[PDB]
Symmetry: D2
Subunit: 268 residues, 4 copies
């Protein structure tokens, strides 16, 4: 009996097979879920990646900065799952911040137009996606977003950390709205995972020193985590997401669950 | 299948068929878990109650204020579960505070001897049980304790709230000890179950999905979730089963 | 002596004599501080208001969305306080959110252009002002911003709460930058105060319900606060800001001080 | 003028001239406050309190001694004169046996040792508030000493558990103190380990106790008039930063 058996779930944010969304989708399908996928910009590329999943799923284009994509979303999803059918789950695994606002560029040197784009994509779109999809969600349903613990300032992450603080606040308000549908809203705050932008930094995209900086960060996470942290394994966080998509966290909403090996509960 | 299929879990704190521990144990068994139970004094009464559970399970005597009970516990658990087998889960559903430190009695009029007993039973005992039971726990295992959000003061709960603050701190350190065993330690912060009436009713109002103080199932499932393999990267943490009330001001 | 004696302090955000910035400036001047004020848009109106202060102070135009104003700010401040002199204090009491994102308008019905404007003015501008003024701040100096506790979601405040969550995160990053200058950065999280927009809402500008929600919020604050809370008295919040501007909190930075009567530490 | 000018303040926890309570007392006196001191070996402490800029009565107070607490208010009043009240109370007492703090493992702390530590470090904040609030002026302030327990850390162990308890205790004392118009707050100081200076945007000097002593004096002043049940951080901002 699959954890997510017979549930219909939207998963956004797949760009590579290292994407956390790829692993969320993989585990969900392994647990019997039937998926609808959305992708940004490179849909042909994305489709080839989604071919590696254990099961087939419709792939829809969704640019969360495009108002016309959002307006048509529920209609396009309903055609994909069949009329008379609704979503039980929604996964928001979308996040972006330009190099000016995340990396090595000084905090003061991020122009607002770049930050505002990061906040649009990483924080506001969580409400946009909930607004668009709630009218086609079943009661008892679950919306999950991806978080990165912003309670303390940290080097490099800069304005993406600020965007995550905003996202945390947005999640609380989305929960108010989603409650009217009998739907939960939560974030999973993950530890660092080697996704595309992180692999690039390690590769020297932002210079030699920065690629060393991230590796030390990842190693200090593992020390701090009482049960350790593997930055090349997205599966543990994908399971936490599926747990929130299940009926086993039925009284948790507007909340943040930490899938970081316990590192945030430890000072050293 | 079952969420907890083939798992062996210690559950403490069953006293009535209304106890949260009772429902955690009931749901655990419904989800394929194989249980060991603990009781404090009236084991015959408790046995008659644990008989109302869906399945039979060994009941061991445990006074957490008794050092000899703690010393023999792992051994008594192992003999009860059969040699060569270990626990996958431990549920700490024990909490106590004399009326002097909780209720209508003023905060300042609680003598320390009463506060100390409450903290012994409600907070220190979480470390006691973890110490005793970790050597016989499987990797991937989970220890869960029950919490009530003490981040803000509230009328009546008083020194028990102080006791929960201590327990949250205790839980972080047990997480430190348990990690080498590959074991998670977390608390589930539940909403009120079963001036104070106004406090408790504010929960349903605050909760985006509402809160039913007479339904223990939602928090019982959440405990079973932490007992499962589905929260594998969470430890030293607090999971809120309160309808989302603690995330809303009004 | 006077608490802020001989200190040169920038104070932004005065629009009426009910503005928190008005009271911050009054208390600062009462404590021997020598002020430079900044105002937005309606400077002749503002000047008439700032004349009611106990002492004279230069008034400069500053629109935090205007890049030319920010680029010229330090120079205009220096010209006002005299070359060879620097600021010891900066008070950021600027905050705005369009009706679409704050009040009675549903959470989902706020267009991003309005949200982005609110976040620009209320959160991003905190970094902008620090960037502009840090090069003319003395070691031992202090920057203070105004906060409204966003840790939990609340009715009406909506997207302004999101903007404050971002602001809290911004403050942590600004403290890092200000540290190189030997300057502290902190926020004061005030309880509700009857300023211009609040008087409008309470007065029925957005209907009877919106004003009642706010009064209900204000009354629950007053009950929750162990020492009470008066929404018409800004002086306690002004004293707290002046305390942070002084040398008496010398080891506090990147932090939040709550001037809310203690309401946030109590559950009813 | 003076920050605490004309204010009367109880200061507890002085044992050496390196103890934080000592520096709190000095700055308070430098700012015009008139002090009452308490001690737990009273003869040695008196030798320490002589090094302050000014004299202050020293009274015996064992917070585990119920009789001392019962007589505490009476003894303070005779030292400051009838008709006069305390404007401030400083709780700078904290203790934990080696079994519950240091190199001894977390699981090996017997409860009798932990319970003693929690008594002195957490419960006694309420005890002292209970005993002294009836002789406190409105606008008054109770300040206790904290060390941020929100995250587990090596060595500190059960004293951290004790500090978590103190933080919860402080909130309830604030409810009680509100009836008197008195504020209750904690100062979470940095250590007075080396990574602290690194995390703090303004740095941290573990050999300089004055910045935190000044922070205590601020809460004792009328300049934080709307803060209660709260924690003020004097750690150079280190708790707000990751790495
Ligand atoms: N990688 C980490 O260390 C880590 C840690 C914590 C949280 N997260 C969060 O997890 C989520 C996924 O991140 P990831 O690490 O897998 O990186 P990723 O690059 O694999 O995923 C980010 C996704 O956002 C999409 N996107 C960007 N702009 C978009 C737009 N306008 N419309 C629709 N989609 C858009 C990209 O196409 C991409 O698929 C993000 O929210 C991220 O902040 C990542
Ligand atoms: N009461 C609430 O509204 C609330 C809400 C959420 C969580 N909790 C927590 O959940 C736990 C159980 O809650 P409950 O509602 O089932 O209360 P309960 O009274 O039914 O359970 C408390 C248990 O503690 C046991 N106990 C007391 N002293 C003991 C000792 N010396 N040795 C062994 N066992 C001892 C009792 O046998 C009892 O079964 C408690 O820790 C409580 O703090 C309570
Ligand atoms: N009033 C409350 O209940 C409350 C509570 C806590 C914190 N605060 C915060 O305190 C600060 C002041 O609030 P207030 O209640 O005194 O409101 P206010 O209206 O008196 O002050 C807000 C000021 O921001 C200015 N402003 C708007 N856009 C600007 C821009 N483009 N550039 C420069 N200035 C601009 C306005 O001119 C106005 O003077 C704000 O940050 C607010 O969010 C308010
Ligand atoms: N030392 C630090 O780095 C640090 C940091 C932050 C906060 N604090 C806290 O500040 C307080 C004082 O710190 P310190 O460094 O001066 O420690 P300290 O050892 O110098 O002082 C602790 C005090 O507790 C007193 N005490 C113990 N038992 C007592 C009892 N039965 N009755 C009355 N007094 C008793 C001792 O006399 C002593 O004066 C402690 O509570 C500590 O937890 C310490
Ligand atoms: C937190 C967190 C961590 C990551 C990888 N995300 C999502 C994310 C996804 C992409 C980007 C991104 O491409 N940023 C621009 C960029 C490109 C290459 C590079 F080496 C560095 C950066 Cl910042 C930034 C963030 N969020
Ligand atoms: C919190 C908090 C409280 C206040 C007054 N602020 C600053 C602020 C200042 C002005 C405005 C503002 O005018 N918003 C638009 C508006 C105008 C009139 C009205 F009745 C309501 C709103 Cl939201 C909104 C916020 N922040």
């Amino acid at each position: 009996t699959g954890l997510l058996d017979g549930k219909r779930i939207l998963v956004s944010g797949i760009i590579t097979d290292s994407s956390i969304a790829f692993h969320i989708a993989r585990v969900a399908q392994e647990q019997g879920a039937q998926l609808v996928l959305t992708g940004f910009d490179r849909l042909r590329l994305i489709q080839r990646i989604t071919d590696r999943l254990p099961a087939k799923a419709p792939l829809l284009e969704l640019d969360v900065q495009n108002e016309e994509h959002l307006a048509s979303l529920a209609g396009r999803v309903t055609e994909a799952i069949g009329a008379g059918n609704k979503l039980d789950g929604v996964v928001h695994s979308i996040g972006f911040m330009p190099q000016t606002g995340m990396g090595i560029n000084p905090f003061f040197d991020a122009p607002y137009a770049d930050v505002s784009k990061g906040i649009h994509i990483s924080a506001y779109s969580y409400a946009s996606m909930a607004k668009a999809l709630l009218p086609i969600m079943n009661p008892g349903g679950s919306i999950v977003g991806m978080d990165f613990d912003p309670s303390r300032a940290m080097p490099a992450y800069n304005w993406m950390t600020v965007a995550k603080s905003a996202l945390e606040s947005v999640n609380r308000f989305v929960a108010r709205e989603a409650g009217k549908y009998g739907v939960r809203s939560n974030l999973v705050a993950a530890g660092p995972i080697r996704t595309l932008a992180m692999s690039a930094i390690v590769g020297g995209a932002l210079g030699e020193e920065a690629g060393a900086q991230i590796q030390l960060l990842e190693e200090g996470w593992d020390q701090r985590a009482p049960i350790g942290w593997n930055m090349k394994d997205a599966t543990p966080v994908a399971k936490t997401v599926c747990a929130l998509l299940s009926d086993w966290l039925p009284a948790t909403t507007g909340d943040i669950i930490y899938a970081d090996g316990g590192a945030h509960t430890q000072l050293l």
